[PDB]
Design a protein around this ligand. Structure first.
Ligand SMILES: Nc1ncnc2c1ncn2[C@@H]1O[C@H](COP(=O)(O)OP(=O)(O)NP(=O)(O)O)[C@@H](O)[C@H]1O
Ligand SMILES: Nc1ncnc2c1ncn2[C@@H]1O[C@H](COP(=O)(O)OP(=O)(O)NP(=O)(O)O)[C@@H](O)[C@H]1O
Ligand SMILES: [Mg+2]
Ligand SMILES: [Mg+2]
Lengths: 245, 242
């Protein structure tokens, strides 16, 4: 009931208070991570001046090449971590009651514009309705956007999005006709910085935070995410989220 | 009583796993990012080790190794404080100003030397007692002097002053200033002036936000002013310890 307490503040309090206290925790977690990310950049710049000065004095080396490319990996990862941190900030975390159609229509309309430009096709098999959800709108927008933007990239010609409602919740299914993901990699694709060796060769995306942002948002929103085989031949991503009443 | 828990027409068992997954989601993300950052660093460190084996010790290699060691500690912090953020940031120890900021200043001189610029410490910190989080206060000065190294044209100056009440750190640069209007704005998170957004396309704007936060949490103050050197003056004031 106190000053800076857990969700175990849940003992007595309403569900609503319970999630705002979680957001209180989350906002500081996001501040910790963005603060550590920002600071990691400075020993890295100094380290990089060190490698530069060494290459000047004793020239190129197998060992120096390793140190330089590892330092470069770190730089990219820290950059995408701050790109995320920038975005997750910029909007206070406030869970509100929001209707599925309002929440995701803009995402889908913008995805259609992007697809049109790429020369690919986006089909919405069944659109979202005024289905009541409870959560942070920006996190859930981002959750769908990451999944459809990934699909616009890895698809060969077509993308498909499909909504389904029930007394218990909403089921969002995204499909692509591009290459899939081997069944083994389907569990790992949700890990931060996990890219398949096939996508690592492409070099047209971030360090691999997209699906990590997705898994986190959806679990925090009392739902689930799954990667499956798509009937279109590529990847199927299924989001399930509960209904609020 | 008040609004109880509702996910769907689900079992208590499903309610508890949903609840566990919901609350531990951000912790797990942060510990997973820490593990993933650690592996290129461990590789980097084996590279430095293999180089020291082949061509021995060097001033340059020593720099690479100590900077790699700084990274290791911060990656460890992310992991350690991921789980418990209980009441935000709550650790503090007694530290002396000279110990706290000497490394920052020595490293700033190395960076300045590389940039072709000059750093002058008009008066250095002494054994002046402070009480707070050392990393926050290190970072607080480092951000201000690293800012001064970037935006200065040729010179940077750092000056310490002590009194019965507190410590006053003054940082100056001969580069462009900041219009009086933007001087309040510059401390906001992810904010950069339109002048810096031209010089460098976009970029982070967390530096002075980390500064304002750390100094306020440590019961002090920060100020942006006109510098006698023609650029920007940043003044940190922090209280002394009982
Ligand atoms: N539709 C898809 N088709 C094929 N592979 C995919 C698809 N979506 C995701 N993946 C794989 O899953 C990995 C992790 O997804 P993700 O987190 O979005 O990384 P990313 O898209 O490459 N980069 P980023 O999202 O910008 O950080 C990718 O690197 C791919 O290997
Ligand atoms: N010493 C300085 N001289 C001139 N302008 C400055 C100085 N320090 C900060 N500024 C301005 O204030 C803005 C915000 O400061 P800051 O938070 O440190 O961001 P940043 O230096 O651009 N990036 P970063 O510190 O790496 O996150 C900068 O983008 C500059 O426009
Ligand atoms: Mg992605
Ligand atoms: Mg800065």
């Amino acid at each position: 009931l106190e000053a800076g307490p857990q969700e175990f503040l849940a003992a007595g309090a309403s569900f609503n208070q319970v999630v705002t206290a979680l957001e209180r925790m989350m906002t500081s977690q996001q501040r910790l991570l963005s603060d550590i990310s920002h600071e990691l950049r400075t020993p890295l710049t100094r380290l990089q001046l060190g490698t530069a000065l060494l290459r000047r004095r004793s020239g190129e080396s197998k060992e120096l090449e390793r140190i330089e490319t590892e330092a470069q990996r770190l730089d990219s990862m820290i950059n995408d971590l701050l790109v995320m941190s920038r975005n997750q900030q910029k909007n206070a975390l406030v869970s509100e009651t929001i209707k599925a159609n309002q929440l995701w229509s803009e995402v889908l309309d913008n995805a259609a514009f992007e697809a049109e430009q790429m020369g690919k096709s986006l089909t919405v098999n069944f659109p979202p309705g005024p289905w009541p959800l409870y959560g942070n709108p920006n996190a859930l927008e981002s959750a769908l956007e990451n999944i459809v933007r990934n699909a616009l990239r890895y698809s060969h010609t077509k993308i498909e999005v499909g909504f389904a409602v029930d007394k218990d919740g909403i089921t969002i299914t995204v499909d692509d006709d591009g290459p899939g993901v081997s069944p083994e990699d389907r569990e790992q694709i949700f890990r931060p910085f996990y890219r398949t060796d096939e996508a690592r060769d492409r070099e047209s995306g971030g360090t691999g935070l997209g699906l990590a942002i997705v898994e986190t948002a959806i679990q925090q929103h009392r739902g689930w995410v799954k990667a499956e085989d798509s009937p279109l031949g590529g990847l199927r991503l299924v989001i399930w989220l509960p209904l609020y009443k």
